[PDB]
């Protein structure tokens, strides 16, 4: 059965879509098909900030970040458990999951 009207990709008016290799398994994936992560991590640990701030020779030395763009085929994405299967109704919504800010 046609599981998604989306057909698992964003290709609507496009005839062809250039491919992008997976980061983990190193496999070609269609570009809009692959789930794209944009991690902005701390360049240090959460607990390393206290030790770094002492060694830093600047008083108000702001902490750099880590701007990495990640590409996952759904095989590596499920293995990393970044995406999960949803029910038939729960599959429909396209909003991002909550950000856990508070």
């Amino acid at each position: 059965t046609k599981k998604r009207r989306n057909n698992g990709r964003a290709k609507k008016g496009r005839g062809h879509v250039q491919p992008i290799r997976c980061t983990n398994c190193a496999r070609c994936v269609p570009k809009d098909k692959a789930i794209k992560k944009f991690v902005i991590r701390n360049i240090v640990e959460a607990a390393a900030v206290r030790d770094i701030s002492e060694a830093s020779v600047f008083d108000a030395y702001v902490l750099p970040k880590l701007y990495v763009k990640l590409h996952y085929c759904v095989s590596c994405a499920i293995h990393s458990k970044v995406v999960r299967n949803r029910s038939r109704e729960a599959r429909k919504d396209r909003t991002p999951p909550p950000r856990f800010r508070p």
Binding site: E45, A46, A47, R50
Partner: protein, 64 residues
């Protein structure tokens, strides 16, 4: 040259770990430096406020 044995006091219990329970994860602070506080996983029964031996400063640190 080598780091001698020091002591640290458990303040809070994080939860179980080791996928069997034989290791419990807790948060400790060092009696030598109260501002110095890390997270250490221990084995055996632990309550809040006790103090335990430590043969090295930092081995593992992670969040469940």
């Amino acid at each position: 040259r080598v780091q001698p044995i020091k002591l640290a006091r458990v303040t809070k219990v994080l939860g179980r770990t080791g996928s069997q329970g034989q290791c419990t994860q807790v948060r400790v602070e060092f009696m030598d430096d109260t501002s110095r506080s890390i997270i250490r996983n221990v084995k055996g029964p632990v309550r809040e406020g006790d103090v335990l031996t430590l043969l090295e400063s930092e081995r593992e640190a992670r969040r469940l």
